[PDB]
Ligand binder design. Structure first.
Ligand SMILES: [Mg+2]
Ligand SMILES: [Mg+2]
Ligand SMILES: [Mg+2]
Ligand SMILES: [Mg+2]
Ligand SMILES: [Mg+2]
Ligand SMILES: [Mg+2]
Ligand SMILES: [Mg+2]
Ligand SMILES: [Mg+2]
Ligand SMILES: [Mg+2]
Ligand SMILES: [Mg+2]
Ligand SMILES: [Mg+2]
Ligand SMILES: [Mg+2]
Ligand SMILES: [Mg+2]
Ligand SMILES: [Mg+2]
Ligand SMILES: [Mg+2]
Lengths: 74, 125, 71, 147, 266, 184, 196, 61, 293
RNA sequence: UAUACAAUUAUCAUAUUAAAUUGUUAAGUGUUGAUUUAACCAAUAAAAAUAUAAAUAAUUUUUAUUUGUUUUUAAACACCAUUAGGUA
RNA sequence: AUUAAAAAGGUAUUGUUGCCCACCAAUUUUUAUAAUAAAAAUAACGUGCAGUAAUUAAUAUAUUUAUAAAAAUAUAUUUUUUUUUUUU
């Protein structure tokens, strides 16, 4: 049984985005700082009061090409 | 699901009578020629969708401009008023409509029904 | 389609529609319109689990609007 | 629609069998396949053959005496618009005489070159590595089997 | 994530924004090099062709009237949809509206059993060439699956550039040597240039820099084709050996040697 | 025994064997003739043939014929082969479009370059380099140049190549045009 | 930092549980491998495992594309050589260097043309690797069983036509002379399989 | 929906200058400018595959 | 070296690798350079003599021609001129081909109110909108573009039909009178020697056995033709050719060579029609089972 | 010894809302013979093309009906045995 | 002055000097005893070399065949390795 060469290291083509999505780091860093035991990085000091946009969702979870996901990149 | 003929998955957001898309005996899908504009071939066609995205347009209201007289005189054709829009529109699918299975799949062979595509022949008019 | 299979309720399927349309991050779902279904809708909109809902006195369906927060 | 009734049958059949009777003063009607078919006289003998078929008709049954059948001619405008039709058709056969083929001038000097380059390809070919399997006999096929 | 066409990860373009030509060329622009400039005008916003089949499987072919004649009694109009042998074209070679395929296979069938079409071959093959879009190698259609034509026109235009290069290299060459009148003790070339560069060298006027030259030219006539008499050793009766000829040592580290290479055919 | 015409043993030559059908003029092949070429005067038939053969080969007809006319294959293996063929075709097309979509960019860069040449030497100069008759003067020079272009543009007939047929031992494919191993 | 995020000190950085159990995969593939050559699972060029991939099957025909070195290959000058051959074959009394000059002029250009095409094609190999190739990550599309799901869809159809019964069944092949050798009462043409 | 790119570059040079990013002042502006000008000649220059654009498990050479 | 093949030449370090570039080739003759330079300059001056732009032009002397352009005749003109050339040119550079065709048409052409119908009139004509778009030629239509037998052979009571059949392991040739009478027997690649107990099967059905066979058959075909025609009273004395229809079974290798061996007989045999009859298997009786299936 | 499957996607044998069934075409004789095959042996060799619409959805067919085994070689190919035949 | 760089499988696991397959003896154990019961443990002897794309690719059904793995044919098929005409 022959496969395409690099399938061992093949990335998850649906979920590989999640890790890097801004909201994630907002939440995590949110409850990390909350402890009192972490010094907030300054980006968090900033986006604290300008949290990112709500309804932009990737094309992986929403399966539509026609959905214009981005207010910016449109 | 790795079984062939089960590949279309579980979709609840369809309009069919089963939530399991692969038992539905109505519309067999076509993996090779389909899904240019809908993304994957499994997913429902644009005009048949029962769930809607945030920044995407939803279904046009069908007519079958006179009535905008009170509006801005300039205002053009409202993007959601469509002359011809059909929720029931049969999209050509080879495994249904052109079915080559009982043949050797040579050039002319396979059984075709013509009742799907609207006739481009001159014979009608 | 056959015997051993579950017998579905327009509650079962109501829920799985909402679930799946929440997973694909859609803003609207079309959903079966019976009594306890739009009952459930009103209750959810009370508790603020759903952005809003409407019944158009369409017979089959009515439509719910989903809410998202922090991505 | 003119329906053939039972009373009118043979009259009509015969009016039809005489459609091409091998002479008339007027232009002849074509086929459903759009051909000018053989003009037979009374009783259905093959008397007049149109030009495209004459070679074969004569080659198959030589003793058959048949004529080339020319259509009756009808003249549009003058011999002037027909001579201008002659100029346009000659210009068509000219643009086609230009586009068709060159072939240089003389044949044998062309054929020489073709056969030569075919030969050159033949012996640039014979130097290609064959497959192991095509090359060897069954002696060492068997040898490698045992081994 | 894939584009539909060839599966690209990006949407194709050449340029996108209004300023990029300006911003890229900026010191040129302040300089005023760019004033009459036609390269920053012509191609500034130029984008790729649409290389796409509006009809992947033609519902457009044939155009309407053709259908009328797709019956059994139109040998010509049957023939414009077959090969020179009479067979149909595979669906993805010459795509046809399914109507046309039905009517066509039916047509050819009827036509044959009535004797109005041959059981093999295309009797209208030449006549039918008008109706076929014969695409001249000289014109370019942006949509082709022909990779040859593309590279052909690439070649053509590049060579058309090279012509210009060469014309203007040899031209000013002939104005280096052709400007020599008062150049003998003239200012046009430095005294030190008289010193160093007035000697024959690889860049100046080499003899030949290459082996296998033409020496000894003469006007003598040609000889007869094949003046030589075939040798006394027969090359014909000798069998050509390839694989087993010399002895080799396998660099195979571990595992059974791949059977497809050694043993598989026959 | 009775064989078809594309069969191996079809036209036999032996003491018993005799050829079937009216064999000349109007013949057994009467309406069964796949191609007809009237030979133009002063034209070698080697061009005629190599055009016919190139035709059949590039449209994969001689492929098909060779294939089916030698040995039997069940409808499953035949399907497997035609569909594999067609799918590899699909793949390679989707490659060609990529190549081409790049090459049209390459050509664009070339044409763009040619424009830059234009505004270095002026348009007319560029034109001169391109074979423009500005020394044309009278019509006779134009006619010499156009007689040049005439003698160029008129096409010599193509000798186009047809790959030979490789006869292997037990003939797994009689479609064999190269020595590469195939998957049957 | 000084280098890639998906490659640490000892090799590829092992994210899924397959790499913690099978950590050969972290550092090895093929013969062409170097330590900087991990995380780029494609190796250099002209090199073992340099080949770019398109829907998973690698691209080994590149030269064949630009029509350098192909059996179908692009041919620059034909009219030339045919003209000169014509002359050579006609007669031996007059000799033509008038043609040979036209021709070798032609070839003299052909050289730089070819270097150009080769160059552009290497640029294509690079562009392709950046913006198209998946680096052997996605399942093959080019063999019929990879499309099995598609075929299934049509088997399903032929079954529901048969009252939802015979899956993957086909009409029994008959005989060459099937119709015309059979007496009345027996099926002269092959039926639907459910209609046996 | 494609704005003009000048404000963007003057901004992105401004940030690197006002942030202390470089020891010698010009380097910020020069590098940012240069890197753009080289990419200007590339086929489909301003689009990028999503996976290779940035840090991810597998990368470009 | 030892029991192995010698490397290709380029696999070795350069033969002349230790000899400096100035030496290969030597540039000698440096003595003559100066001489040939002075020579060429003196020459130039002579070529200047054989034949024998700073004529000061004042701008104020031109004024009349300037006032000529301020009159709106000339500007009506420039406007007309410039509005003609604003039409979106597709040319972009001087192109040789297009020039050629253009002036070709100038040689071909040097050799060469009623009420406007409203939209309503065309609203009532259904036909017209189908005339505008139609493929079908309107006017008297050429008949040779209809008839079935238009492009097809045309035979003669005297023609010889030469059958060249190329098979996989064999090739053979025959001839027939138009009435189907066999002329000479069928010369075969295994009939002529050429085949068995020899070099191999691989080359058995090859190109040059087809050639051998055809060139051997024609050679013998001539005299018996002159005989069969001597019998009926057709002398065919001299300056005669045999009209030939070459029918070819094929797609095998023996085909190519075969027809070539006919082409060289062009001084004797005149080929009117080249038409191949090669059987195509739509479906039919089982072929013999091969190895795999 | 007792002590908590799944119910959103699971490959070997308990099917189920379906439009089919029926079409009489083709092919055949000139003559002295190495065809096919990696290789043997028996020994006339050519051939069998046409159909869409339409049939309504579900609720008591599960002892019913249904899933490539088929008369006629005086018709072949093919296949199996080896010159005798079997089968097709 | 003629050619060569880039696509590939492992039932093994420092890996083909790798592993495995059936018959062919003893024994051990349960039973629903069919040439000579069946099934399971098993480490002799003897025949081979069936399998790992594996020396006529394999897998499933079907029919036949048989020292033993298995082999022939008819279908489907890739848990086998790919080679690619958008009217020429
Ligand atoms: Mg395997
Ligand atoms: Mg691997
Ligand atoms: Mg018999
Ligand atoms: Mg590798
Ligand atoms: Mg069950
Ligand atoms: Mg017991
Ligand atoms: Mg036992
Ligand atoms: Mg085996
Ligand atoms: Mg074995
Ligand atoms: Mg095996
Ligand atoms: Mg098996
Ligand atoms: Mg079995
Ligand atoms: Mg056995
Ligand atoms: Mg078995
Ligand atoms: Mg088998």
């Amino acid at each position: 049984y022959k496969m395409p060469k690099n399938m061992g290291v093949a990335p998850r083509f649906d979920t590989w985005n999640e890790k890097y999505e801004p909201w994630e780091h907002m939440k995590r860093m949110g409850r990390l700082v909350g402890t009192g035991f972490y010094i907030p990085p300054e980006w968090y000091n900033h986006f604290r009061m300008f949290p990112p946009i709500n309804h932009n969702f990737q094309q992986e979870k929403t399966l539509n090409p026609h959905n214009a996901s981005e207010p910016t990149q449109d | 699901a790795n079984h062939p003929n089960r590949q279309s998955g579980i979709q609840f957001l369809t309009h069919y009578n089963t939530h399991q898309r692969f038992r539905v005996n109505k519309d067999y899908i076509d993996y090779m020629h389909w899904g240019k504009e809908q993304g994957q071939a499994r997913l429902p066609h644009r005009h048949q969708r029962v769930a809607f995205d945030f920044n995407d347009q939803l279904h046009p209201t069908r007519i079958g401009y006179a009535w905008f007289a009170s509006q801005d005189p300039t205002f053009g054709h409202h993007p959601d008023l469509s002359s011809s829009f059909d929720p029931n529109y049969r999209v050509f699918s080879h495994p249904e409509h052109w079915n080559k299975m009982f043949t050797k799949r040579r050039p002319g062979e396979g059984d075709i029904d013509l009742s799907v595509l609207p006739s481009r022949s001159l014979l009608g008019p | 389609r056959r015997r051993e299979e579950n017998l579905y309720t327009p509650i079962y399927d109501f829920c799985h529609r909402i679930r799946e349309a929440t997973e694909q991050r859609k803003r609207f779902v079309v959903v079966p319109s019976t009594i306890e279904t739009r009952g459930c809708a009103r209750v959810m909109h009370d508790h603020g689990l759903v952005a809003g809902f409407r019944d158009f006195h369409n017979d089959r369906a009515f439509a719910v609007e989903l809410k998202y927060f922090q991505g | 629609i003119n329906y053939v009734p039972h009373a009118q049958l043979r009259e009509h059949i015969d009016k039809e069998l005489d459609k091409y009777v091998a002479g008339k003063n007027e232009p002849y009607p074509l086929n459903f396949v759009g051909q000018m078919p053989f003009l037979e006289d009374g009783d259905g003998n093959i008397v007049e053959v149109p030009e495209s078929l004459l070679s074969n008709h004569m080659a198959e049954h030589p003793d058959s005496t048949a004529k080339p059948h020319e259509p009756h001619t009808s003249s549009s405008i003058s011999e002037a618009a027909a001579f201008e039709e002659r100029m346009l058709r000659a210009m068509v056969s000219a643009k086609e005489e230009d586009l068709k083929e060159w072939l240089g001038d003389d044949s044998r000097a062309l054929s020489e070159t073709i056969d030569d380059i075919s030969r050159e390809e033949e012996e640039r070919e014979a130097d290609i590595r064959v497959a192991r399997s095509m090359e060897e006999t069954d002696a060492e096929r068997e040898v490698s089997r045992r081994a | 994530r894939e584009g539909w066409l060839f599966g690209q990860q990006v949407q194709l373009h050449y340029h996108r924004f209004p300023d990029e030509q300006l911003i890229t060329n900026l010191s040129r622009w302040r300089t005023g090099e760019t004033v009459g400039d036609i390269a920053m005008q012509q191609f500034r916003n130029a984008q790729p062709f649409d290389i796409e089949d509006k009809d992947p499987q033609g519902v457009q072919r044939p155009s309407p009237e053709v259908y009328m004649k797709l019956n059994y009694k139109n040998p010509a109009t049957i023939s414009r949809f077959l090969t020179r042998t009479g067979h149909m074209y595979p669906a993805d070679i010459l795509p046809l509206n399914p109507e046309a395929v039905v009517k066509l296979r039916v047509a050819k069938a009827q036509a044959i059993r009535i004797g109005l079409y041959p059981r093999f071959g295309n009797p209208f093959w030449f006549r039918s060439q008008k109706f076929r879009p014969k695409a001249y190698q000289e014109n370019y259609d942006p949509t082709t699956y022909s990779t040859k034509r593309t590279v052909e026109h690439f070649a053509y235009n590049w060579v058309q550039t090279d012509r210009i290069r060469r014309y203007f290299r040899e031209l000013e060459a002939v104005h280096t040597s052709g400007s020599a009148s008062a150049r003998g003790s003239g200012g046009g070339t430095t005294a030190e240039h008289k010193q160093q560069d007035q000697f024959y060298s690889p860049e100046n006027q080499p003899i030949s820099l290459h082996r296998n030259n033409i020496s000894y030219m003469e006007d003598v006539g040609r000889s007869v084709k094949n003046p030589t008499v075939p040798g006394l050793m027969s090359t014909k009766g000798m069998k050509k050996k390839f694989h087993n000829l010399y002895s080799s040592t396998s660099t195979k580290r571990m595992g059974f040697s791949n059977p497809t290479l050694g043993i598989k055919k026959v | 025994g009775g064989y078809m015409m594309y069969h191996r043993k079809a036209m036999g030559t032996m003491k018993y064997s005799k050829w079937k059908g009216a064999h000349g003029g109007i013949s057994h092949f009467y309406g069964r003739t796949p191609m007809v070429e009237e030979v133009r005067p002063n034209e070698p038939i080697t061009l005629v043939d190599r055009r016919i053969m190139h035709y059949v080969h590039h449209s994969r007809l001689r492929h098909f014929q060779l294939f089916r006319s030698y040995q039997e294959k069940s409808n499953s293996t035949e399907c497997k082969l035609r569909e594999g063929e067609m799918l590899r075709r699909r793949w390679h097309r989707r490659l060609q479009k990529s190549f081409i979509a790049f090459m049209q960019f390459k050509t664009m860069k070339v044409l763009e370059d040619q424009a830059r040449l234009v505004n270095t030497y002026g348009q007319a100069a560029v034109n001169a380099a391109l074979g423009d008759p500005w020394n044309a003067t009278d019509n006779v020079a134009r006619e010499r140049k156009s007689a040049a272009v005439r003698r160029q543009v008129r096409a010599l007939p193509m000798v186009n190549v047809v790959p030979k047929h490789v006869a292997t031992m037990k003939q797994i494919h009689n479609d064999r045009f190269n020595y590469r191993w195939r998957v049957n | 930092r000084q280098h890639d995020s998906g490659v640490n000190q000892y090799g590829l950085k092992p994210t899924n549980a397959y790499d913690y159990i099978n950590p050969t995969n972290l550092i090895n593939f093929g013969r062409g491998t170097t330590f900087d050559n991990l995380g780029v699972r494609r190796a250099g060029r002209g090199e073992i495992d340099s080949s770019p991939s398109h829907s998973g099957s690698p691209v080994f025909t590149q030269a064949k594309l630009i029509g350098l070195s192909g059996e179908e290959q692009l041919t620059m000058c034909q009219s030339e050589t045919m003209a000169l051959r014509l002359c050579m074959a006609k007669a031996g009394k007059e000799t033509c260097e008038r043609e040979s000059r036209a021709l070798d002029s032609c070839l003299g250009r052909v050289g730089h043309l070819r270097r150009a095409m080769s160059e552009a094609c290497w640029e294509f190999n690079d562009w392709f690797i950046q913006n198209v190739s998946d680096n052997h990550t996605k399942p093959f599309q080019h063999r019929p069983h990879d499309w099995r799901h598609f075929y299934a869809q049509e088997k399903l159809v032929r079954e529901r036509q048969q009252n939802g019964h015979a899956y993957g069944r086909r009409p029994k092949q008959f005989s060459f002379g099937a119709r015309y050798v059979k007496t009345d009462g027996y099926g002269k043409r092959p039926r639907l399989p459910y209609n046996k | 929906g494609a704005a003009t790119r000048l404000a963007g570059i003057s901004a992105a040079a401004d940030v690197m200058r006002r942030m202390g990013l470089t020891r010698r002042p010009m380097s910020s502006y020069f590098e940012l400018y240069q890197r753009i000008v080289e990419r200007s000649e590339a086929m489909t220059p301003w689009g990028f595959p999503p996976l290779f654009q940035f840090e991810e498990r597998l990368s470009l050479e | 070296r030892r029991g192995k093949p010698r490397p290709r030449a380029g696999m070795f370090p350069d033969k002349y690798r230790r000899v400096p570039m100035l030496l290969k080739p030597q540039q000698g003759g440096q003595q003559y350079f100066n001489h040939f330079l002075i020579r060429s300059t003196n020459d130039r001056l002579t070529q200047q003599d054989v034949d024998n732009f700073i004529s000061p032009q004042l701008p104020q002397m031109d004024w009349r021609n300037m006032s000529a352009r301020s009159s709106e005749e000339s500007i009506r003109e420039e406007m007309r001129q410039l509005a003609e050339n604003d039409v979106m040119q597709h040319q972009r550079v001087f192109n040789e081909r297009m020039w050629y065709e253009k002036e070709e048409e100038h040689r071909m052409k040097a050799r060469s109110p009623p009420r406007v119908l409203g939209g309503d009139y065309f609203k009532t004509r259904f036909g017209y909108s189908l005339v505008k778009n139609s493929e079908m030629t309107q006017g008297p239509v050429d008949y040779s573009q209809l008839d079935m037998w238009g492009e097809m052979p045309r035979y003669t009571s005297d023609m010889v039909f030469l059958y060249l059949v190329s098979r996989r392991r064999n090739t053979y040739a025959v001839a027939y009178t138009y009435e189907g009478k066999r002329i000479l027997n069928t010369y075969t690649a295994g009939n002529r020697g050429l085949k068995g107990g020899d070099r191999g099967f691989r080359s058995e059905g090859s190109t040059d056995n087809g050639h051998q066979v055809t060139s051997m058959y024609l050679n013998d075909l001539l005299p018996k033709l002159r005989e069969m025609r001597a019998s009926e009273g057709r002398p065919m004395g001299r300056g005669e050719k045999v009209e030939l229809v070459v029918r070819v079974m094929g797609f095998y290798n023996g085909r190519q060579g075969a027809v070539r061996a006919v082409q060289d007989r062009a001084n004797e045999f005149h080929v009117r029609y080249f038409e191949d009859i090669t059987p195509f298997p739509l479906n039919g009786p089982k072929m013999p089972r091969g190895v795999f299936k």
